[PDB]
Ligand binder design. Structure first.
Ligand code: SF4
Ligand code: SF4
Lengths: 113, 208, 114, 176, 82, 96
């Protein structure tokens, strides 16, 4: 359809969204392959990324792909995929699936005092 | 309970409880408590050392997308050893939701600054310093933002009096605006307004 | 009793930072006197800086002296740039107020304050 | 439920582009602004002749404070200290003692008119309509201490402005 | 910066302009703390007096070992050719 | 409204509108400064029977915040809410 503008300032319109989204989702899965399986974060974001990849793979169109992905325009979907990739790399760096590092004091979260 | 009582939102309560369990399951290294209030507000109380990852998760996970930092607050409760409670309010425009993240520090422990996650905090937590003395490590430009330049002490601490310790007046001998110890013409009348009868039985604390 | 440090692991690095801050203030004082057109001398300002440094010289916790060095650095940057006026620089020199009594007898004469 | 302000594609045909070129070569919109100002010159200005004319006011107006009386000479205030307890700026100072006939009356009623934010909480917390905010607003002084009203000044203000305060209360009290 | 006696008399000279040190007990091998009776900040301003007069910068971890005029003149001799 | 017809025509021509229909200065069309006395209605709790306060007390129905997790399978991933609906363009004046 060659959409003229996305309506968002500073967010350019992507010529080919399908191949870009497939590349981002495959990169996300490749990155998540390093997280241990028993971590709940890997399972949850693997499930949602697999769902979004199935939708973006079984859909030739763009407008109703946007309307059924429920993520606004396709360009902000691509932006969120890149953000999820960066988050997955940082999650690998941080390792937050480990147990709690410190108990709080006895009356730390008691309200009212 | 129809006309004068605020109606409940049970579906929002269920959704917020489910998302709180989701967040507390994804990040067990840092979160310590997850609660939902009676008016459907989600509070996630976490360890201070996870103030950088958790927010980043809420900024970047596809199921959270809390892209907006609405507010940043410090609360002073002197009865705790970690007397300062630091509160982040996040708004997610994609899912139309709000979340609250609370950490705890005392006067001497520094905090990792959340400028790299949210840029607005670059002023907000700076104000916290100017009001509380909570040091934020790795801040780009940390200084006072509201008090006077020669101001000593942090005013929003609960051990700081309402009127300060100094006050300004013009002196013609030195031709200058000078500071002198405060002497009020009228003392601030303190009112003891608390009734000695218990009002809310649901919030009654167990005895000792 | 294990705590998160601010900048210094022990007292030696904290004393090093104190030394740097005192060096910077001692270098700054003549520029403050000349730029603000104060009526004080360089000796008076340097003696005032030494007075605050010796007044605040009984601490032994690395985090406390770290925060004190931080606040002194903030005051130094507020003086390096022209953000303070003449009044804010002269806040340290309490000239307008009368000198308070020190011995028992004068405090007994003036009022009930211990 | 939303509209697109400034998303108009101008026409590229010769007529519209010549109209635009004539607009930026002959200053059409500047003439439009000149015509707007010239038309606004010949209208009657909305300037009133103060102090010979006054702006319109409602009987709910909160101006200078006053202490009222009963229609027998007895003052209405019975020293209940609700106004000084509800005053947000702590402008009211009340000291009371029983007088010679044993009534509960005030001995000191000061209102600091430089502290008062003119919010009308005192006149709405009074159970006997003793303290009121009158309609007077032209009471600027030349000295700071003249704005420190005691009981005598407020009683004089009440006796001065009763003939208007009573009418305002009569016109307004059904909404309270 | 030419001869060691030149640096020695310059160091002694800048010691002479310092006011809180008595001229009586000052010698070449006079200690700042336990002999001349000075604080740490007095040694600090002595060190930046040396920095001002000699015109070269001295870092703090070097300046904490210069506790009498002998290591001061040795330190100026070391960092220059002489 | 006291202007002559020539001045009115000049104002209408230079402004571009008909200014006599919409005059900013107020006139006799406004409400009277004195009004008849009102009779205000009462609320729903102004009743003599079946009006016990324990059955309509909103403050006493507030509970403490329920704790979801505390430190003392194949469940689907969730969201704080269903995703927001796309805004529809205005049919009144879309400015397009
Ligand atoms: S109007 Fe408000 S601020 Fe003024 S005296 Fe009354 S209660 Fe106080
Ligand atoms: S509220 Fe009224 S009656 Fe009570 S002390 Fe004030 S003026 Fe007097």
């Amino acid at each position: 359809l060659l959409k003229k503008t996305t309506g968002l300032v500073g967010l350019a319109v992507c010529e080919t969204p399908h191949e870009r989204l497939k590349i981002l989702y495959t990169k996300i899965l490749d990155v998540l392959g390093h997280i241990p399986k028993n971590a709940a974060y890997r399972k949850y974001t693997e499930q949602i990324t697999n769902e979004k990849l199935s939708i973006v793979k079984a859909e030739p169109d763009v407008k109703k792909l946007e309307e059924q992905l429920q993520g606004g325009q396709i360009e902000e979907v691509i932006l969120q995929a890149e953000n999820e990739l960066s988050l997955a790399r940082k999650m690998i760096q941080w390792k937050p699936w480990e147990p709690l590092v410190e108990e709080p004091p006895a009356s730390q979260w008691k309200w009212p005092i | 309970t129809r006309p004068t009582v605020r109606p409940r939102n049970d579906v929002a309560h269920k959704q917020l409880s489910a998302f709180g369990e989701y967040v507390a399951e994804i990040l067990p290294k840092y979160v310590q408590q997850v609660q939902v209030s009676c008016f459907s507000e989600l509070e996630i109380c976490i360890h201070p050392d996870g103030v950088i990852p958790v927010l980043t998760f809420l900024r970047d996970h596809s199921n959270a997308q809390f892209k907006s930092l609405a507010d940043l607050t410090a609360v002073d409760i002197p009865t705790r050893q970690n007397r300062f409670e630091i509160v982040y309010n996040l708004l997610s425009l994609r899912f139309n939701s709000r979340i609250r993240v609370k950490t705890y520090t005392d006067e001497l422990t520094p905090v990792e600054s959340s400028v790299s996650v949210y840029k607005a905090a670059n002023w907000y937590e700076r104000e916290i310093w100017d009001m509380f003395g909570v040091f934020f490590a790795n801040h780009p430009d940390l200084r006072r933002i509201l008090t006077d330049y020669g101001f000593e002490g942090h005013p929003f601490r609960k051990d700081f009096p309402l009127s300060g310790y100094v006050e300004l007046r013009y002196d013609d001998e030195v031709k200058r605006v000078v500071a002198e110890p405060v002497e009020l013409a009228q003392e601030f009348r303190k009112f003891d307004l608390n009734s000695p009868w218990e009002a809310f039985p649901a919030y009654r604390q167990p005895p000792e | 009793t294990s705590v998160k440090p601010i900048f210094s692991r022990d007292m030696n690095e904290a004393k090093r930072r104190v030394r740097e801050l005192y060096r910077a203030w001692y270098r700054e004082v003549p520029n403050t006197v000349h730029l603000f057109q104060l009526d004080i001398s360089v000796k008076q300002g340097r003696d005032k800086v030494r007075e605050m440094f010796k007044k605040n010289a009984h601490v032994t916790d690395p985090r406390v002296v770290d925060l004190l060095v931080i606040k002194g650095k903030m005051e130094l940057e507020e003086t390096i740039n022209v953000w303070k006026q003449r009044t804010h620089v002269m806040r340290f020199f309490h000239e307008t107020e009368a000198p308070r009594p020190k011995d028992f007898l004068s405090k007994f004469y003036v009022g009930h304050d211990p | 439920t939303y509209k697109y302000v400034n998303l108009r594609e101008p026409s590229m045909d010769m007529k519209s582009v010549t109209d635009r070129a004539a607009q930026t070569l002959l200053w059409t919109e500047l003439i439009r602004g000149l015509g707007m100002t010239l038309s606004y010159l010949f209208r009657e200005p909305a300037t009133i002749n103060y102090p010979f004319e006054k702006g319109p006011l409602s009987p709910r107006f909160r101006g200078e404070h006053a202490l009222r009386r009963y229609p027998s000479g007895e003052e209405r205030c019975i020293a209940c200290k609700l106004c000084e307890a509800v005053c947000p700026a702590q402008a009211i100072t009340i000291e009371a003692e029983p007088r010679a006939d044993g009534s509960r009356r005030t001995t000191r009623y000061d209102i600091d008119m430089t502290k008062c934010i003119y919010c009308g909480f005192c006149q709405e917390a009074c159970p006997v309509d003793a303290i009121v905010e009158g309609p007077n607003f032209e009471f600027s002084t030349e000295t700071h201490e003249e704005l420190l009203y005691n009981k005598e000044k407020l009683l004089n203000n009440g006796d001065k402005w009763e003939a208007e305060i009573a009418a305002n209360i009569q016109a307004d009290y059904l909404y309270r | 910066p030419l001869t060691l006696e030149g640096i020695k008399d310059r160091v002694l000279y800048v010691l002479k302009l310092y006011d809180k040190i008595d001229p009586e007990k000052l010698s070449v091998n006079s200690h700042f703390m336990k002999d001349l009776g000075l604080d740490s900040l007095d040694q600090v301003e002595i060190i930046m007096a040396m920095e001002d007069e000699f015109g070269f910068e001295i870092p703090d971890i070097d300046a904490e070992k210069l506790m009498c005029p002998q290591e001061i003149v040795d330190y100026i001799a070391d960092k220059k050719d002489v | 409204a006291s202007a002559t017809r020539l001045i009115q025509g000049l104002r209408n021509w230079a402004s571009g509108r008909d200014l006599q229909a919409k005059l900013q200065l107020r006139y006799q069309e406004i409400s009277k400064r004195t009004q008849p006395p009102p009779k205000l209605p009462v609320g729903p709790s102004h009743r003599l029977s079946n009006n016990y306060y324990c059955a309509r007390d909103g403050r006493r129905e507030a509970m403490p915040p329920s704790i979801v997790m505390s430190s003392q399978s194949e469940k689907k991933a969730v969201s704080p809410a269903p995703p927001i609906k796309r805004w529809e363009l205005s049919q009144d004046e879309p400015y397009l």
